């Protein structure tokens, strides 16, 4: 029961059970369906909804060649980094948006889901890295990070740290440290004369 004139499965991404960790953010290509973004912008359940390069009303009458949906989980105080030209632990080492980002960013508090009583240690983030990430780069490598003069040889030691750290979400945390799920819609508009599309 599937056709090309069907509706895009936006539920699979937003209303998903588990979400990826930010350092290993999950990307889905939305393809071969009718994307109706009215289900999103007419919904008061999101706490952050900011598009860059496009008016959110113009989404339904534009022409896209590729549409990607990135999901992950971070802290509250880190949602401000899911935007072009930002810095911090998430923008430099985990998920970097380009300066010419043409898409949307949708965040919402999921403390009632991604926080367990003793601390949900399934959500991780990269803490150490040599160089910054490129835009949309993904580093799932768990190689020991060398913060000193002598090599580490894949062994946790003095000046030899494991690069991933856990959030440890508990419901008793402040909103700045509660888990926030983030969906990042990226677009690629096709080059055409205005007479064709716009």
């Amino acid at each position, epitope marked *: 029961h599937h056709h090309h004139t069907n509706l895009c499965p936006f539920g699979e991404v937003f209303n998903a059970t588990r979400f990826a960790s930010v350092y290993a953010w999950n990307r889905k290509r939305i393809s071969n369906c009718v994307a109706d973004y009215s289900v999103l912008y007419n919904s008061a359940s999101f706490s952050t909804f900011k598009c860059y390069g496009v008016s959110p009303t113009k989404l339904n009458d534009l022409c896209f060649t590729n549409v990607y949906a990135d999901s992950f989980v971070i802290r509250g105080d880190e949602v401000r980094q899911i935007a072009p030209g930002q810095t911090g632990n998430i923008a430099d080492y985990n998920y970097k948006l380009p300066d010419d980002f043409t898409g949307c960013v949708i965040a919402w508090n999921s403390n009632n889901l991604d926080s367990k009583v003793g601390g949900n240690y399934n959500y991780l983030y990269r803490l150490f890295r040599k160089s910054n990430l490129k835009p949309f780069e993904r580093d799932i490598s768990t190689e020991i990070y060398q913060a000193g003069s002598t090599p580490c040889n894949g062994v946790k030691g003095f000046n030899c740290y494991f690069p991933l750290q856990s959030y440890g979400f508990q419901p008793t945390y*402040g*909103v700045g*440290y509660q888990p926030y799920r983030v969906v990042v819609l990226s677009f690629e508009l096709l080059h055409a004369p205005a007479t064709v599309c716009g």
Partner: antibody
Amino acid sequence: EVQLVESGGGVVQPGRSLRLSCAASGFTFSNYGIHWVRQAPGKGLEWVAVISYDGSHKYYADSVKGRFTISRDNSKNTLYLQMNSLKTEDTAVYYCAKDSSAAIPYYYYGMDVWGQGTTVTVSS
Amino acid sequence: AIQMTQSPDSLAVSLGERATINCKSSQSILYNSNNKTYLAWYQQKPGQPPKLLIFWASTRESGVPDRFSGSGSGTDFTLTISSLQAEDVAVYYCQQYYSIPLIFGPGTKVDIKR
């Protein structure tokens, strides 16, 4: 809803020892380094010590080097400061200052959360 | 040790006017391998602990009003309050965290100019 609570301050004779403690809540305490910053009455802020997010790196101020001993207990979400051979020049308020990311030489991101601060008086 | 110096020691300025605080370090706080100056700005009111306003010299901390801005690179730094409010009367410290020991400035007292 995050807070650091100092503890253990009081009056101490010169040369005697006293241990301060600072309890943290509302955030994953084992992910961030913590500092101790003291402030003499009516004088500027002075940095004291720091401990990394695991206890590996501990550095102290030149004015308290070898006299103070910083330590933490990530299982109980508590950090400690062990002061010995106290001077009247150590009389001050002692704040614990949470860092923004660990505490390896080049990973000091500044301190964003501070405690109310416990008071330490050293006088005969 | 990296010695921090602030000028002026006290700046009384009327409300809605701009307040400028400066901070000079004895050594360069700009790290070569990431182009980040390890300079911060703290605000301390009576009876209260300090409060982080600016880190990385120019990045404003989450929850700080837009009238607080930091500038400068290397050794000369400046915290600027574009339109001084009545609630901004406090003591402002700059602090370096490039190398150890971490060292604060002498502090600058800011009061309203009646």
